[PDB]
């Protein structure tokens, strides 16, 4: 016998599935971190429609979830107040020098990532882990981040003692038995996550939602393929498979294997001759890539069909093309201001199989939240995400503001046929935006490859203050900024590459009264034709400072004649100064000894062209 008692075998609290099926190393993971955490039970995830059921029954009868009786099969969770959001503070990447994960800021305060060493790692994961799963049960979720069997996929494993963790990941990855025999012997992320509250419980419950808010802490160890995450039980803290593994730990994985793991939506376009192109876009979180993603567009004979919304993954072919996939298997969107107006094709998606996360119940059994904008009949009434009764005059929302849906992506009436295809989808069009209230029109073309990256790193957008939020990937970078601008530069020197077009958008404009100067949502359509027939390499373009713009009379204006194109379309010498003036003091202090050449040069390019005017 391989053991002088009984090992480190936990078979005896499997409730689900068998250790034995599992690969060697998989089981090794397992039973070492059940070791370390002591969970009462053991669930080994087979993703069946039956283990869902039995998941959310389960959670329905300890008062985690509520069911939601307007619709088919959806879900109500409400949270502890101090954990509603993916935290940055708490999010950490170790590795042994800290300028790998992060350029060295000349202020000593770095906006581009968060490094801990090793030891200060190793003192925090003993004050945390062990222990921390008593009295729980440790789930096993074997996933595939990519469609399973795609040469773009990855596979983790994820430990969590969360069953709202495993029934998100059921919808946000492809996870079950079919991933664990596709794996066999191979390579995996080692994802641990736990909420941090042991049985019994040192610390009131709030809301039936287990935290541990003081001792969050998100922690990723590229050189060790692992993600230890601890404390938080939401969204991008909790499902590791999103943030975690598919931007940062993908992201330095990308940077040396020669690919690319973005904050992109990618979505399919096809005009009313027939012809049909994919389109990537990076927006911060809160500037509106789900709505992009899922557009009904107001021109006539127009489509858009949704490959992803949040997370792309891209890898140039032997062919050349900048192939695209969507390593996510559904979408965590956003649910306030989500409406027919703004999302129809979210609307639909959301009705059957969805988790709700933090937003408002109405008295029938549905959801609410504001923008909604849908009138509830006279005496229908709303019970806030706080679990309190609540009107439209109440001081506070009724859903929190980073409330969210949890649906599956194959629901989605829009869904492209090709939001599965192995070898991705070829994309002709890449699109940086954010929020700018002043001096950036509402749609402008780069005008080099090198120009373009420089438009990624320029990025800004207003939370809080205009901030810098470059690529859409501040939160993310899996390492050092400097180093991911030249890996995008490099993409230049691929032989035979076909370089997607850049363009940069803002959909929020506003004139001096605060008042947007252009509609947005499925009128962005036109914005996108225009971008089109760009990569057609139509006639559309006028040159300025910032790159191209669109001709007078260029964009499809009919059904928009209040639209003030003068201040929507304008470009201020003294703006941009200031903000040539701005970009160049934040990458000296931010990225200085690691900022390439080529981007130093295009900031100088950008100034020049602006003392021309
Ligand atoms: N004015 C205007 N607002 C828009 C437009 N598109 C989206 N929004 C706003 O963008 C917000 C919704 O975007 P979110 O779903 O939070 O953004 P996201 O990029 O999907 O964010 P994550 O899922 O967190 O990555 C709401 O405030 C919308 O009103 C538009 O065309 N015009
Ligand atoms: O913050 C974002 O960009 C999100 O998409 C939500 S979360 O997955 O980070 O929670
Ligand atoms: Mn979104
Ligand atoms: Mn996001
Ligand atoms: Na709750």
Redesign the pocket.
Known sequence: PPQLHNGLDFSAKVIQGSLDSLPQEVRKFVEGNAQLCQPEYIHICDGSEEEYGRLLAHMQEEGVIRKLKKYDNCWLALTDPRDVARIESKTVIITQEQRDTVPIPKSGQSQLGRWMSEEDFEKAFNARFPGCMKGRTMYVIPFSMGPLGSPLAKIGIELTDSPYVVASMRIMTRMGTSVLEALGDGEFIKCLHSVGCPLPLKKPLVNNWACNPELTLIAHLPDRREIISFGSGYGGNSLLGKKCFALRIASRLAKEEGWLAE?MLILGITNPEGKKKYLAAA??????????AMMNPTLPGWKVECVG??IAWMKFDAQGNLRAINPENGF???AP?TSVK?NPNAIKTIQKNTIFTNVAETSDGGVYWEGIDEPLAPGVTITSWKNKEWRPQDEEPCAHPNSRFCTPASQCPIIDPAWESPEGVPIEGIIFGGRRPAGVPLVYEALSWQHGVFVGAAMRSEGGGIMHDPFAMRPFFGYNFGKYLAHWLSMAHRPAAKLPKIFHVN??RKDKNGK?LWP??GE?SRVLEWMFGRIEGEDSAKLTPIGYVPKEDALNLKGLGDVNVEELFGISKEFWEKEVEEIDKYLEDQVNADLPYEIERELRALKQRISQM
């Not at 809160?286 to 992009?292: F, I, P, R, V």
């Open positions: 904050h927006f911060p979180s809160a500037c509106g890539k789900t709505n992009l919304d949040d965590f969107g956003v201001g703004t959909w929020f947007f947005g949502f962005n």
